[PDB]
Amino acid sequence: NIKKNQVMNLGPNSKLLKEYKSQLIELNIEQFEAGIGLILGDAYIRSRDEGKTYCMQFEWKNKAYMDHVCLLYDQWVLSPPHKRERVNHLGNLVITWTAQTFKHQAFNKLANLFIVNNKKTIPNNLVENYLTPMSLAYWFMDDGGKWDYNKNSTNKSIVLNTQSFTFEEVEYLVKGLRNKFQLNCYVKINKNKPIIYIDSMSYLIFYNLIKPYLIPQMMYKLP
DNA sequence: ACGCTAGGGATAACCGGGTAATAC
DNA sequence: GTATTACCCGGTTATCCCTAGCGT
Ligand SMILES: [Ca+2]
Ligand SMILES: [Ca+2]
Ligand SMILES: [Ca+2]
């Protein structure tokens, strides 16, 4: 075999790199299930060879969450998280962490569920067939948040920020969330765009499913 | 009198493209 | 000189959080 450490400094077209990539066949169960939530959430899955191979790009503010995701698909990620620091139009410095997998056919397994002809879509019964408690956990760590950010609140309502998807796509996601996980949720409007509102009634049932995957530095997102 | 929204803001993400390092 | 491609860019804004002030 070939160790990861031997190709953590070699160039992109390295012979030893390609032989290491041939040793890896598919994503493991944890990498696929989490991938679902990540692609629904904050991750970006892309092909440059028109569908032959795919890779995932990551960018987050939270260094620790970036570290956790990098460790997940450890064998798919060559480098440690890289730091950016950019100046925006106001003239403010913005600190963010970035990382990416190498391209590999194993990622086609994930991308074939979302990317159809360049543009990302959501299949009719995605949640019912593919979304697991682990998928919901990473999706929450990406898009999750509170409904009530007022200090001192009895409202334990969860929100999933899905402003990028169409109202139809989100409506279908709500159908899955209600049926598979018995969640009292529905679509709400924010900036003329859809979000998933989870009622405080289903908070216990939602928390129990995502407990065995949550990281401490992401516990602030919970009410 | 104050809980709870809808409205809003400066990000914290998401998109592709460019490049610099190997193979032949 | 052309193919390959992980790492690194810049464009750009929908995000997650914050809160005015509405509604009872
Ligand atoms: Ca997201
Ligand atoms: Ca996020
Ligand atoms: Ca976005």
Strands (E), A84-161: 86-87, 93-94, 97-100, 144-146, 158-160
Q: In angstroms, rounded to a whole number, what is the distance separating the alpha carbons of residues A181 and A132?
A: 9
Task: Check if residue A97 sits with its Cβ under 7 angstroms from strand C.
Answer: no
The answer for residues whose C-beta is within 8 angstroms of residue A211's C-beta and 6 or more apart is: none
Task: Check if residue A117 sits with its Cβ under 7 angstroms from strand B.
Answer: no
Chain-centre distance for alpha carbon A58: 9
Task: Check if residue A102 sits with its Cβ under 7 angstroms from strand B.
Answer: no
- In the reported structure, the alpha carbon of residue A164 is separated from the centroid of ligand 3 by a whole-number distance in angstroms of 7
Question: By the 8 A CB rule, do A35 and A27 touch?
Answer: yes
- In the reported structure, the alpha carbon of residue A14 is separated from the centroid of ligand 1 by a whole-number distance in angstroms of 34
Q: Between the CA of residue A190 and those of A5, A94, A164, A183, A187, what are the distances in Å?
A: 46, 25, 11, 21, 10
Query: What type of residue is A19?
Result: E
Q: In angstroms, rounded to a whole number, what is the distance separating the alpha carbons of residues A42 and A34?
A: 12
Q: In angstroms, rounded to a whole number, what is the distance separating the alpha carbons of residues A137 and A38?
A: 9
Experimentally determined by: X-ray
Which residues surround the ion ligand 1 when the cut-off is CB under 5 Å?
A 41-42, 142-143
Report helix, strand or coil for A154. coil
* Phi, psi for A121 (deg, rounded to 5): -130, 175
Within 7 A of a protein CB, which nucleotides of strand B? 3-16, 20-24
Question: Locate tokens 């995932």: which residue?
Answer: A56
Task: Check if residue A192 sits with its Cβ under 7 angstroms from strand B.
Answer: no
Task: Check if residue A152 sits with its Cβ under 7 angstroms from strand B.
Answer: yes
Q: In angstroms, rounded to a whole number, what is the distance separating the alpha carbons of residues A215 and A60?
A: 15
Which domains does chain A show, CATH number per domain? 1-120 (3.10.28.10), 121-223 (3.10.28.10)
Rg (Cα) of chain A, in Å, rounded? 19
Give the CA count within 13 Å in the CB-facing half-sphere of A15.
0
> In the complex, which nucleotide's C1' lies nearest to the CA atom of residue A90?
B10
Q: In angstroms, rounded to a whole number, what is the distance separating the alpha carbons of residues A75 and A176?
A: 32
Which helix (H) or strand (E) is A178 found in, with range? helix A167-180
CA-to-C1' distance for A150 and B4, Å?
Answer: 9
Task: Check if residue A62 sits with its Cβ under 7 angstroms from strand B.
Answer: yes
Question: Locate tokens 């929450």: which residue?
Answer: A140
| Structure tokens belonging to residue A82 | 């890289």
Q: In angstroms, rounded to a whole number, what is the distance separating the alpha carbons of residues A138 and A63?
A: 15
Within 7 A of a protein CB, which nucleotides of strand C? 3-10, 12-20
Question: By the 8 A CB rule, do A16 and A7 touch?
Answer: yes
Question: By the 8 A CB rule, do A145 and A192 touch?
Answer: no
